[PDB]
Each structure stands twice: as C-alpha cells, then as structure tokens.
C-alpha cells in the first residue's frame, strides 16, 4: 500500500493507533482514534490493515526497532521518546500530522529525490550563508519510495522529506562545506543512556537557539564552528563528540517537502521539524552521538547539474 492512502486512512480515523502510555492513549482517544496498548497489538499476524505506532517511552524503542522485517502489519511510527516524550509534543505532533497536505508533500519529495539523484551538488542559501553539498556517483537514501512494504517501518516524518545519508562511509554519498544560518535544531537519541549524557546540554542549546543568531559552519564535511543564541558553543559540542562515531562529520542532508500548516516553533524537539520546508544538515547517528539536525526552514535550494 501507498503512503498517501496511509495518511488518508489516518485522517479518517480509519486505523488503530498503538500507544505505549495511558495518558498519551487518552489524548489519542480524544482525537477520535481507537487505541491499542503497545504490548497488546498483534504485530505478528499477516495483515493488510495498517496501524500507527506512537512510542512515548524510551524503554520501548528497542522493541520498536525489533519490528523491522518482522511485523505483519504495514506501519508508521511517531517515536516521540527519541526526542521529547511529553504530552504537549504528542498533542502538537498529532495536530501537525493530521494537518499536513501529504499528497503535495509526496509529489515534492519525489521531484526532490530525482533532483538529488541527478545533481553534482546542491547549494543551500540561508540568509547570507551558502552551504554546498557535493553528491557522489552512488547516492544513499534512507527511503525514496512512496509505498509501505510488508515488514518495514517508517517514521511518519519520512514521507515528508527527501534526504541523502552517508551510510556506508564518512562521505560515501556526500560531503558538505560552507555556512548554514539556521532557525533551530532537533536531536534524536536511540537510548536512555545517550539522552542522559547529551540531553542537558542539547536542551540548553535548544533554549538558546530561540534567540536567533544561530550558525553552523562545515569545512571538509566537519563542523568547525557552531553558534547558538549568538554564542560560540563549538567546544561544548566537540567535547562530548570527541572519539564518538564520526565526530562532527555530516551524516545526513535533506529538504523539507511539506507545507507548514500547524508546524511547531523551533526551540522544542519535534521530530516533524524538518518537514515544513527549507533544508537541514545533520550530524551523528543516534547511537553514541545524537542525530542532530540543523534546520533552515526558509532556506532556498539550487541544484547544480
């Protein structure tokens, strides 16, 4: 089945919503959905009927990932626990998911991937800055399709963005250089340990980013300057990044393909922040460095053949 039909069934309350928290379940029930506890949903039996999985407790993220290639149901998920599991993020996140024009987003995403596959480089203009993303001959993408294949899981945000990833190597697909003034950032952690080591500092950066004057600069694919709230914080980030994963190397670049209806303000850690236009550049893998995306919501994009 198609992503477009999935989003249509979701807006029509035509599928169950699997939830791992009773308070979140009550919020989802108030929006008109049938809710099923996470431990109670039959993920095994083959089924053509889809479901949305909302994961608000970090303790269930390993179980969510374990559904990969095992689930009998077409699924998307909203893994709030990896970002910020609070109820306000659930309410706002669901408002955004139910408001976005997903058909237009899927068309823009298709066109963007074809551009990313046919370009030597991409220029991202944000204020006075220009970030250049040089794309290689073999382009790695997390997901360029429009369908939900059996056993695969997808974040609800996946079909609203077009992204290329340095999956195999530090620059197996692209490398970046230049400056990106940005509106805000988000950060994804796949474990409680990681979120505890990094969250205090990143939430402080998040707080300070609301005062604008945010800039990330890349040299030879690696951050060499980070400014948040007009304050250089490069050494803070480098201190925790030291010796982990690929340090401050760019791991992902992408374009937000959706409208901005009910989009949330920067300064909260919403997994939907990349989708509402512009472009973003990311570091980390979410394993020993959070996957951090610096987002320029109003950036303009030029593809170079």
Residue numbers in the entry: 17 to 321
What does the article say, verbatim?
Crocagins (1 and 2)24 are very small, intriguing RiPPs that possess a tetracyclic ring system, which consists of a pyrroloindoline fused to a tetrahydropyrimidinone moiety. Here we use in vitro experiments to demonstrate that three proteins, CgnB, CgnC and CgnE, are sufficient for the production of the hallmark tetracyclic crocagin core from the precursor peptide CgnA. We further show that the hydrolase CgnD liberates the crocagin core scaffold, which is subsequently N-methylated by CgnL. The crystal structures of the homologues CgnB and CgnE reveal them to be the founding members of a peptide-binding protein family and allow us to rationalize their distinct functions.
First, the structure of CgnE was determined to 2.0 Å. In CgnE, the metal binding site of Zn2+ 1 was disrupted by mutations in two metal-coordinating residues (CgnB numbering), Glu274Lys and His280Tyr, and no density for metal ions was observed in the CgnE structure. As expected for homologous proteins, the Cα root-mean-square deviation (r.m.s.d.) between the structures of CgnB and CgnE was only 1.2 Å over 284 residues. The aminopeptidases form an extensive dimer interface, and the residues involved in its formation are largely missing in CgnB and CgnE, which rationalizes their monomeric state in the crystals. The leader peptide is enriched with positively charged amino acids, and both CgnB and CgnE show a large, strongly negatively charged patch near the possible binding site. We found the binding of CgnE to the CgnALP to be almost 300 times weaker than binding to CgnA (KD = 514 µM). The main driver for binding thus appears to be the core peptide, and it is tempting to suggest that CgnE’s role may be to recruit the substrate peptide to CgnC and present the core peptide in a particular way that enables or accelerates correctly timed catalysis. CgnE appears to recruit the substrate peptide CgnA to CgnC and assist in catalysis, perhaps by presenting the core peptide in a specific conformation or by ensuring appropriate timing of the hydroxylation reactions, but does not seem to possess catalytic activity itself.
